[PDB]
Every structure is written in structure tokens, then in C-alpha cells.
Point group: D2
Amino acid sequence: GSVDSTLGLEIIEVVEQAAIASAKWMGKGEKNTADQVAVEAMRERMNKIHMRGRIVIGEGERDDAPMLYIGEEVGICTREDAKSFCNPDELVEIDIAVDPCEGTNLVAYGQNGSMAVLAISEKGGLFAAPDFYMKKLAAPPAAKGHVDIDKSATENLKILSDCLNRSIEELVVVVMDRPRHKELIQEIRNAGARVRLISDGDVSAAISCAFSGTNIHALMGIGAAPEGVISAAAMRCLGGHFQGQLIYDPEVVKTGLIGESREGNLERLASMGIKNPDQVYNCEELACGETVLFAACGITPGTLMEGVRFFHGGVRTQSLVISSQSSTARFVDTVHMKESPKVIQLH
Amino acid sequence: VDSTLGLEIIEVVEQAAIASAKWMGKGEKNTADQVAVEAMRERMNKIHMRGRIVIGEGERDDAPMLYIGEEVGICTREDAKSFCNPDELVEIDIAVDPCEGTNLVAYGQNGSMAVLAISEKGGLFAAPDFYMKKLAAPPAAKGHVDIDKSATENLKILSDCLNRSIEELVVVVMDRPRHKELIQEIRNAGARVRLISDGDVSAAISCAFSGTNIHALMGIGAAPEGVISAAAMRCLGGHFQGQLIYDPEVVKTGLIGESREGNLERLASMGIKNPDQVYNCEELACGETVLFAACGITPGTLMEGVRFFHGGVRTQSLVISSQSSTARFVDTVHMKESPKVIQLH
Amino acid sequence: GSVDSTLGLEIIEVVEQAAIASAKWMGKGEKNTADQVAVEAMRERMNKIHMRGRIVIGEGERDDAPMLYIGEEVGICTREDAKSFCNPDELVEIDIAVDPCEGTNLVAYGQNGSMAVLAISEKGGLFAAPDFYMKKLAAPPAAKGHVDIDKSATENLKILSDCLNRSIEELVVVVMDRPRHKELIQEIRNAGARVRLISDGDVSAAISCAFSGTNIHALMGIGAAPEGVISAAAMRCLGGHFQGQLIYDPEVVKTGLIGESREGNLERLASMGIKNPDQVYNCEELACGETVLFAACGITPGTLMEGVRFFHGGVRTQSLVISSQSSTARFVDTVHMKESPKVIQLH
Amino acid sequence: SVDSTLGLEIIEVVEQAAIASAKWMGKGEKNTADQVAVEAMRERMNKIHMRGRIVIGEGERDDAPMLYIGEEVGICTREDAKSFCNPDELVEIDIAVDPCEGTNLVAYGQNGSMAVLAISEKGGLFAAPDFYMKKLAAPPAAKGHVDIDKSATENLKILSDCLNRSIEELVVVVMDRPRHKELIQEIRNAGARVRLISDGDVSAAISCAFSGTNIHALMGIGAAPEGVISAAAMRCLGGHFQGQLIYDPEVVKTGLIGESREGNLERLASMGIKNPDQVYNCEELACGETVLFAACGITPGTLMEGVRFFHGGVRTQSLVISSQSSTARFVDTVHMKESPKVIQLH
Ligand SMILES: Nc1ncnc2c1ncn2[C@@H]1O[C@H](COP(=O)(O)O)[C@@H](O)[C@H]1O
Ligand SMILES: Nc1ncnc2c1ncn2[C@@H]1O[C@H](COP(=O)(O)O)[C@@H](O)[C@H]1O
Ligand SMILES: Nc1ncnc2c1ncn2[C@@H]1O[C@H](COP(=O)(O)O)[C@@H](O)[C@H]1O
Ligand SMILES: Nc1ncnc2c1ncn2[C@@H]1O[C@H](COP(=O)(O)O)[C@@H](O)[C@H]1O
Ligand SMILES: [Cl-]
Ligand SMILES: [Cl-]
Ligand SMILES: [Cl-]
Ligand SMILES: [Cl-]
Ligand SMILES: [Cl-]
Ligand SMILES: [Cl-]
Ligand SMILES: [Cl-]
Ligand SMILES: [Cl-]
Ligand SMILES: [Cl-]
Ligand SMILES: [Cl-]
Ligand SMILES: [Cl-]
Ligand SMILES: [Cl-]
Ligand SMILES: [Cl-]
Ligand SMILES: [Cl-]
Ligand SMILES: [Cl-]
Ligand SMILES: [Cl-]
Ligand SMILES: [Cl-]
Ligand SMILES: [Cl-]
Ligand SMILES: [Cl-]
Ligand SMILES: [Cl-]
Ligand SMILES: [Cl-]
Ligand SMILES: [Cl-]
Ligand SMILES: [Cl-]
Ligand SMILES: [Mg+2]
Ligand SMILES: [Mg+2]
Ligand SMILES: [Mg+2]
Ligand SMILES: [Mg+2]
Ligand SMILES: [Mg+2]
Ligand SMILES: [Mg+2]
Ligand SMILES: [Mg+2]
Ligand SMILES: [Mg+2]
């Protein structure tokens, strides 16, 4: 059959539960704990769905990550003993990209910008990105195809100016606060644009570019490739601009494995069957499937989504779920009622 | 009842609202009603469920769509056993009000929504088309106010329960001659009032959320709408009581030669032993599982109305489930399509 | 001197106090009481301002309306000893148009759309409109000068469609629910636009056109002339489109009394020195002063402003104040603390 | 008596300072972001018919060119003021300013920065020296129940009771500093969630006063002057705020060369501060009969939205609190510049 329509709704609960678990550790100074509980919650809720999924982006390779590892099967319909309870649509093989705790250190420090996020497409519909750095350009729909990752930041800012009908001084660029971005950040400043430096969480920044109202208009710089594919899935559905280019030269940015070599990384990519390492991927190439789903829920507060709030008698979450199938972007504001709360706030 | 049914109903109310909204201010209340009915029905029939309409547009051989007893959903057909699973094959009863406030839509006025409620078979009081005295109030007031108490005593109780003065209370009442004395009493008590021409469902549920500046609904409305309201209120833990009214001296249906003696007959032949019985919302929505869904057609207290813009549509729905024990506001941008601008709000 | 800068800020308190007073009568079924308290409160608060004001649009003529009548002097600096306790800027003569309770029946019924409103300019800076009907066309800044009040509703909708870059079906026109608008409403429906019929209060409707997010894009039809001037004041500061034209034909619309005639009205209009009654004015003409101020506060909830809320330990109001002098549109969300609230809500 | 319109005119003061500073968001110049805010604030203040003295500001006259301690601001400070100012405008008022609260937040384009000031009659505001200050901020419902001398653990228990919610349902803001290692661990051990900030404890303190911020207390050590400014706001809101001067470099160091506990003790005595270990509540930190507070977001924060530059204008959000009118005002201002074709409702 074809990807189950209700999947795009049911993923709301996946990210909600993952975020709620992770949020209990906000500012607790335990980044691995924040990450691990989100992983367990996401995996648990996904395994209760009537789907036949494979993790193509996750916590690591099979013998590195015990849960949500690359190649892991998730969903009721992956089980030999339960497959007969699944209908043809639910049996459709789908690939899944997960990032249960985007910004583990943001959560640990109780800082803004963290979220629980996943993306889905039919089998083979998501670029199974290796854990390499990725040069990224994110921009709003109005600039899609007009800006380009190969152009300089200055040129892109001028193009954004035209496309968004505002001055460069009236633009805001998000860049990760990293030494590798010193020249890039200086260039953006010299061009006249304002900047928001983030310590982590470039998935939220990228997607923020798509929505007029965030006062964020572009993401520039180098982040992680897997996160890039997840961002691209959202942008593909929203019609936003997103390009990525894999970085494999330790001179530009270091992977952190001693001792990394340009040829070393090159061989691995070749080994993974990646023919063109300098290849630039646009949005539709990183998320190329016929059906693309995206789900996110705020853990801590951010530009796109409110953080998880714990109050007397319940919890409140905010999620964004995007579906190419229904062609919708849904903001879900959920009050989770614990036990007969005497007061329920409208907002 | 399937866990995903509580999410699927989002699309049910969204599509009903969108269709009806296209007729905002067009002065056709039946048209606005009919396209909503059809859209809700069509979207329901795409769902893997075996549903039955227990509250709807009318009886079979009268109302063409969403009539009493109508089977809806995929699993109602033969053989569902082959196409849907045991959870999906479960029999559920459905109460619909596809266009609540048909004149509101026709006039482009606030307060209309597409609404429905669900439970297991037997889980919803299949209210007859009679009037119902209603009392809705916030969870803080649940069990403290009472429908049999006067407006004045209820206001005093509300004052204590909500820790605010009567002057700091707002009561919603339907603008009807039958409420002249009630409205006068509320005014004398010192509470502020919002009079509505139609749509007491939104008013009832608004009592449940702090921030609506609405704290109670009082008066007489339709019984079916009462049940749908009670479904939401039970999930939220809000106060809701209803009492059937069958005395034309108090209020008339419009049926020719309608008599109290006559109404009582009808009620009995319908299987209702005590027509003067007060039901709380747990009794009106008594099923193990209760679901409630609403989407704004025009702007209102709980939800924004439907907006059409260049490149799509935007809706706001409220979905409430006792199974997940959640209240979900769903703000959906319907991209149609490839819009160059997407607003955050 | 020039109109005092602080006057643009002081009028916040004027509309807030008028709206708060009026809101106490929400749903009481007394439209005159709701009107009178707003009138008195606005007047009282204006009389504490260091200004030299004259009412040019108000509740009626002296010897008829007791408060805020035509020609009434308001403000501390209208006193005979003014020069001694007022500075030059405070002594400038300003004309004031008031509508203390816009939508008295809305308040009486506890329905949406009522507000306390006023406009200010230097002496002569506001058209002292007579109490006649006025044909009006309101639209957003993007359509300014493109739509025209003399064009048909059908023509204007096509122009609006082009200007706002959306279809006619994606437009919302507000028209007063009146028998005089039967054909107009039908034409708008035929053209494919959606419609909001209002029972009262076309001031809010006109200004809503200027703000994206209101889902209101045009005001068409006939309303009261004085309300039109007040609306024109706001639209002038906002750059919105607003045209007015006096209507004095009893066959088109009647003022209700008595033995009224076009010829009779024509004489009265000549009597006030209104040469050309059929003259079409835009908002720059209706509010032609060098300085224009506009202030409004919601009484009941509406499209621009939230209504007045009374809660335990205070009151909450939302006002909109627009100044040509500071070139600002200010939404003022005020928590009035009746000491001392144990709980203060952020919103 | 203090002029009523002053409580409104300060909207423009913080707006102009915030707008000027916001132009430097993420531009890596904390000193520039700071300088322009200072200048815009002072320039705007000097257009006001007031008789003001700076009691909290950028530094001593020798060290700071603008908004220095003792500087006179406002039209009615001029020699001929009696001639052009009225009696209320002639009332001597003390002013505390922090034109750029979080200069590095702005330079890095991070959340939490504001332009802010506080006003009272002469002697109405504690003229805090630039020393560190132990602070405890909490909501009105907890006022007088929590206490700065109590441990974080007991205060959290008290907060739980007052705010009717579990300790796990509380969020405490703490500055991310080594001096707070133990304090943070204790809060974590008690079961509360934590938001660590790199700067901007004024915003964190005031956020405690408003339900909806999901922030319930501020604990730890910040700058004393900022504390006084925070107290003015909290005093007007009925929120809890206590401060205690810290002068022992063993706890926290000013960084000045050879600063010693006795050194600071000597300095405080010199300044006329009788008891350096005294605990002040916000009524004591802001003791004036009339208190005014004004803040405008520079970058986005929990309390206020940041400055947005768009095609045809700027948008700011400010909070202005007055004990005189007893009002808390949020001001959302679209600065049109000019003839913008599109004006967003929000
Ligand atoms: N034309 C406008 N009029 C008023 N406010 C605006 C306008 N454009 C942007 N804003 C404000 O700036 C925020 C960010 O806008 P944007 O930078 O386009 O994402 C919006 O959410 C509004 O608060
Ligand atoms: N304690 C409070 N402090 C500030 N504003 C409030 C408070 N209570 C209510 N409000 C305002 O009044 C609205 C309606 O409140 P309520 O009548 O409880 O629904 C809220 O959404 C706020 O805008
Ligand atoms: N391009 C868009 N994307 C998403 N929502 C929109 C868009 N345009 C308008 N809306 C929604 O419709 C409302 C009214 O828009 P408008 O008719 O332009 O005033 C907005 O406040 C949004 O909720
Ligand atoms: N009783 C409640 N019902 C629903 N949402 C709530 C409730 N209490 C708090 N929240 C949410 O949590 C946020 C912060 O709450 P608080 O920690 O009291 O500031 C609010 O703005 C709401 O979004
Ligand atoms: Cl499994
Ligand atoms: Cl942060
Ligand atoms: Cl990496
Ligand atoms: Cl698209
Ligand atoms: Cl792209
Ligand atoms: Cl859809
Ligand atoms: Cl419950
Ligand atoms: Cl059937
Ligand atoms: Cl109806
Ligand atoms: Cl009656
Ligand atoms: Cl009926
Ligand atoms: Cl007089
Ligand atoms: Cl006078
Ligand atoms: Cl009116
Ligand atoms: Cl004259
Ligand atoms: Cl006609
Ligand atoms: Cl009416
Ligand atoms: Cl009118
Ligand atoms: Cl203009
Ligand atoms: Cl014209
Ligand atoms: Cl003008
Ligand atoms: Cl409205
Ligand atoms: Cl630095
Ligand atoms: Mg992770
Ligand atoms: Mg990550
Ligand atoms: Mg219907
Ligand atoms: Mg109905
Ligand atoms: Mg009036
Ligand atoms: Mg009027
Ligand atoms: Mg400073
Ligand atoms: Mg500071």
C-alpha cells in the first residue's frame, strides 16, 4: 500500500512523550540522562505504532547505541508474530530519522532551543547521513532556489534582502557559536545583518527560517549532517530552502577522532557508497521520498516551540507536525491532565 | 476505542469547519450547515471505525445525512473483520453538530464551530430533540453549584469557589424571551452577562478554561447540544448538569398543538422513566471512553475562525480525550499550496 | 508651540478609564447607562490633562447633551488662569473628536466590538462632521489610492484582490447589517468575497483593515459621519485607505425624524457652510491637522483589542494608541492592580 | 509630588535605548551595544520635564562620561527651571539606570537583555555601590514566607507550599557561575528544575512575579545595583525580593587588585553603610513613596519580546510599572518608518 495517513498524526505522541521525559531533567546538569530518557520514551512510543519502520538516522551504529541504532526495526508491524494484525498500509516499509534530544546540553543547562524530533519517509526516502559535519544554508520559502550554499554569505544576504523585501540590517542570521565560524560571522556582521549565536540546536534554527514571525531568516555555517537531513525533511514539506554539503576535511572542522585524515574520511564515504563527497544536496535530495513526515516537540523554550511546562495537575507541551501527505503544518498545544486539575489555563 | 481515533477526529472537524467557513456571510444558513454535515460525514467514512450516529441532523427518511442510526466509518461495512482490527472494529456512538450556529456562519458572526463527541456504544445519552435546562461551571465549582439552585445562590457559590466577586463573574445566557426573568436575576445579583443568539456549546465549555472570562452558562438550550457539551466537560472535569424541559408554558418546540401531557407521552414511549431527572455530565457522557472535537468556523472564545489566505487555509481546533486525558489545541496551516509566505501565527 | 508630545501617551489613561467604567455595564441591558458612564469617565480624565481642548465631535449640542457637547472646553489649560500654570505646548488649542462608547448596544448585550475611542488634532485639524450618514470605503495601506469609493463593490474587490495578492474568496468584507445595504451585500456575495455583517460599530471594522492578521480587508457601506472622521484619523496615521462621502437623501437612508427631505438636508448642509455635500474626502482631508492622535480601548472583546476583564485583585484592559507625531501604533496591555494581587497573570 | 505623566514618558526612554542597542545584536561589540543604549536613554531623559539625579548608573563622573553617579538629567534641572517647569515637574527624583542589561547577551545575540531604569523621589532608591549582592526573588504568593537567610532547600519547600505545586514543578533561575556550584547542586538535589543564565538576572527576578513565565524564583549572587532596580519592580508588583551585600572575595571577587574583606569593609563604612551584612527587602531597597519601573526588551526574553527590525519599521515590547497609578503596563509598539505597506497586528 502507501504510508498510513494516521502515522502523521500519531507521531505527535511520539515527540510529546520523548520531550516530556527529557524535560524532567532540565537544568539538572545530566546531558546523557536527558538524552537517554528521551531515546527510551521515543523508542517505546514508536514500538506501539502499527508501522514497519527502520532507523536510518539515530543514536549510532548497532553496537555503539543500544537503542534507536542504525538499522533497528521499530513498530508493531516489524514483529513476525504481530504482522498479521497489520493492514497493507501499516506494512509499508518506512525509514525513520530520530533525534530524541536535540540539544542535550541545552536541556542539561536549562537553556533555550532544545526539542525532540523525528522524520519519516518510505524506505529509501531519507538520506542516511553519516555522522560527518555538514555545511548548511537554510532560508524561507520566498528565497528557495534564489539563495545558494555555494554563494558567499554576503551574496546570500543581498539575495535574501531582495526575496524578503527588507534591508540586510532587517535580517537576522543564526550561526552556531564555534571557532570554525569566526570568519563567517565576521562577514555576516560586515554585511550589516544582525546575528543570533546559538550554543547548540541548529535544527530549530533552520526550521525557524520558514515561519514569518520568528525574526530569523537564515541559517548559515556548519552543523551535523544527520540533523541536516531532519531539518531538510521539514523544509521540503514547508517549501523552505535547505541545502547541505558534507565536510570531510579536518582542516575546516575536526570530527574529534584521532587521528582523522581527509583521505581517511574520504575512504569511509567511498566505503559507504557515497560517490561524490563534494556533492551539494538540495532539500528534495536529502528528503527525497514521495511521503515526508516531520514531528517536533519543544523540550526547553525556543523560537519555534514553547518548552515543556510542569504545573499542579499536569504538563503542557507544544509540538510542530508537518506532513507532505496532508500538506499541513500543525502546531499542537497539549495540556496533559494528571489528576482532576482544579484549574485549566486557556494558554 | 482505538488510541488514534482521538487524533483522527482533528481532521474530521477541520474539514467540516473549512467547508462551512466558505459560506461565511453568504446568508445561506442551510448551505453552510449542509456542506459541514457532508464534509464531517465524508471524513468520518475514511476512518477505520464502526460508528453509529446517536445525535445528529434527524431521523432516517427525513435527514439525508448523519441521521439517527446511520452507520459511519470504514469498519461498518462487511466485512470489516477482514479490513480493520479488533480495536477498530469496536462499536462507537457518535454525537454530531457539524455546524453549531448556522445563522452565525450565514451572517459572518462569531461563535460558530463544527463539533462532535464520541464514546463506546451506549456511552452517550441519545438525547431527544427537547429543550434542556443547563448549568455549566469551572472544575473549581464542580459539585458545588447545582442546577436546582437559583441563579443568585449559584453566583454566590461561584464567588467562593472561584475566589472572586460576583461583579468579577461573567455568565452566558441565550438571548431568549424564556430567559427574561433569569437574565434579570443575574443582573440583580451583580454579575456581568454575555447574551448569545445561538451556540451554547462553546459557552458551556469556555467555563472550563481560565482566560476565557466566562465562568458559567445558565438557561435552557437544546438537549443534544447539552450531551455534546457534557462530553467535553466530563473530560475536563468541569461542572455540567442538564434537565429536560417538556412544558410548553416554559418553552415551545414549535410542533403543532404541543402539550406537556403530549411531550410526557413521547418521552415515555421513548424509554425515559423520569423526565424531571437531573443528569450530571458523567451520566450524559457515561461511556468508558469519551472523545470531544471542535473546530472554529467563525472566531469564538476557544478557537479562531477559519481564515483563507494566499496559499492556504488556517484552522484552530480543540480536541479532548479521556483516554489520553488531554486537551489539545490544534493550529493547522493547510498549505494549498507552495505558499511563498507561512505565518507563525 | 506644538501639540505636547506627552498628550499621545496621556490619552492611554483617558480611553482605559472610559472603557473600564462602561465595561461594568456589560450585559446589563442598559445601553444609555453604558454610554453615559464612558462619557463621564472620558471627560473627567481629559479634564485632568494639561491641554486646551475643544470638542468638535461629540454627544450633541450644548443645551441638549450635558457632557462632551459640541464646543465644550476640556482640559486644565482651558481655564482662565491657564498661562500661569501651563507651558506653551500645553496651551496650544487642540480639537477633539469623541466616541466614548462605540457600540452601546454591544455593551448592553455583552457582545463583541465595542470600544472607547477619541481622536485629536490642532484646532481645525479634524472635520467637525454633522450627524449625517456617510458612505465609506476602508482598505489596507497596500490598496491605498487603488480602490476608490466611487467604483463599484465588484470593481473594488478585483482591485483589492490584485493589491493584497489574494483571491476574492480569500477576502473578507465588513458591512453593517442594515436594509440600506441589501444590494451592496448581494453584490459582494456575487463577487465571491466572504462577509461579516455587523449590527453596530463600523469604527473598529474600518481600522481592522489596516492590520494584517485581523482577517478583515475592507469596510463598505454607509455609516455615521462623525464615526467616519474618528476612523479616518487612525487610518491617516496608519497609511490605510479611507474615503468618506456624506449621504443626505432620505430615500437612500433616513435619520428618522422628522418629515425629513433631501432639500431640507441640503439647506442645513449649506447652513453649516458645507458647500459641496457630494464631495468625496480621503482620510488626510478628514483628519488634515499637522498632528493627529488616535486612542481606543476595548470595552468588550473585538478584532483589534481584548475586552475589559475584572478579576480577583484587579482589572485588565487593552488599548490601541496611534500618533502621527511619534509615528507609532501602540498596543497597551494594562493590569490595573487593586492591591495587592496574590497572582499576576502574564497575559 | 512626582509628575503622573513621568510614568508614561519612560516608555519612550527604554524604547529608544533598546532600539539603539538592538541594532548591535550579535555584532560582537558589547561596549558598542552598551554605549548607544546609554546615550539614547540619557538623550531621551533630558527631553523630559523632570528634575533628576542619577544614583545608579555607569560609574563615577571621572570614569563614565554619560549617566554618571550624581549627574543631573531632565529639562527641569536647568538654572531657569522655575520659569518653564511646574511644581510637580520640579520635584527632585532619584534615578537608577541600566541602559543595556546584559551587554554580552546583545553582542552574542542571546536572550535576556533589556534596557531598564527605576525612579523614585530623592532618597527613594538605595544607591547601591558596585558590590555583589546575594538575592532571593519569588512570586507575590511567597512574599515574606521564603527568606534569603534560609537555605535553598527550605525555601523550595516553602515555595512549593505557597505556589501550591510540587518542588519538581518549580523552576529556579541561577546565574551560571563557579560561585554557584553548590547552590545549583542543592536545588537539583531538592528536586527543582533549573534555568542557568550567562547574564541578565534583572529579567529573571521580575519573571518570578508573573504566572506564565514558568519561573518561580531567582537565587544566588548578582550585582547590587541591578538588585535595587529589580526591587523597584518587585515592590510595585508585591513580589518577593531580598538583597544582601557580599564583600568577601573568598565568596566572590570583584577582580580589582588586592581587594580584601577588610578593604571592602573599609570602603562600605566610608560610604556610610552602617551594617554591611544587613538584609534588605524590596521595600527597603526601593523605599520611596513613589516608585517607577521601565523595561524594554533588547533581545528576546521570558518577560519581554526583543526588538524586531522589519520593512518599514521597528517593534518593541516594554513593561512599565507604577506604584502611583498602581499599574503594570505591557507596551507593544510598532514604530512606523515609514508608510509601511504592511502592518502586522502582532
Ligand atoms: N510589517 C510589520 N508590521 C508590524 N510588525 C512586524 C512587521 N513585520 C514583522 N513584525 C514583527 O516582527 C516579528 C518578526 O518578523 P519576521 O522578522 O518577518 O519574522 C513579527 O512577529 C512581528 O512582531
Ligand atoms: N490574576 C490576574 N492577573 C492578571 N490578569 C488576569 C488575572 N486573572 C485574569 N486576568 C485576565 O483576565 C482574563 C480572563 O480571566 P478569567 O476571568 O479567569 O477567565 C485572563 O486571560 C487575563 O487576561
Ligand atoms: N501566509 C500565511 N500563512 C499562515 N497563516 C496565515 C497566512 N496569512 C494569513 N494567515 C492567518 O490568517 C490570519 C489573518 O490573515 P489576513 O487575512 O492577512 O489578515 C493571520 O493572523 C493568520 O492566522
Ligand atoms: N493549570 C494550568 N493549566 C494549563 N496550563 C498551565 C497551567 N498552569 C501553567 N500552565 C502552563 O504553564 C505556563 C507557565 O506556568 P507557571 O509555571 O505558573 O508560570 C503557563 O503559561 C501555561 O502555558
Ligand atoms: Cl519490537
Ligand atoms: Cl537560553
Ligand atoms: Cl560529527
Ligand atoms: Cl512545498
Ligand atoms: Cl532547497
Ligand atoms: Cl489536509
Ligand atoms: Cl478529570
Ligand atoms: Cl446506515
Ligand atoms: Cl444552529
Ligand atoms: Cl420568561
Ligand atoms: Cl428544538
Ligand atoms: Cl467647560
Ligand atoms: Cl474644565
Ligand atoms: Cl454605538
Ligand atoms: Cl472655528
Ligand atoms: Cl438597497
Ligand atoms: Cl443585538
Ligand atoms: Cl456608524
Ligand atoms: Cl503614514
Ligand atoms: Cl479621495
Ligand atoms: Cl493629517
Ligand atoms: Cl470579534
Ligand atoms: Cl568576550
Ligand atoms: Mg538524541
Ligand atoms: Mg542533536
Ligand atoms: Mg448541524
Ligand atoms: Mg446547534
Ligand atoms: Mg458615545
Ligand atoms: Mg457610535
Ligand atoms: Mg548599561
Ligand atoms: Mg547589567
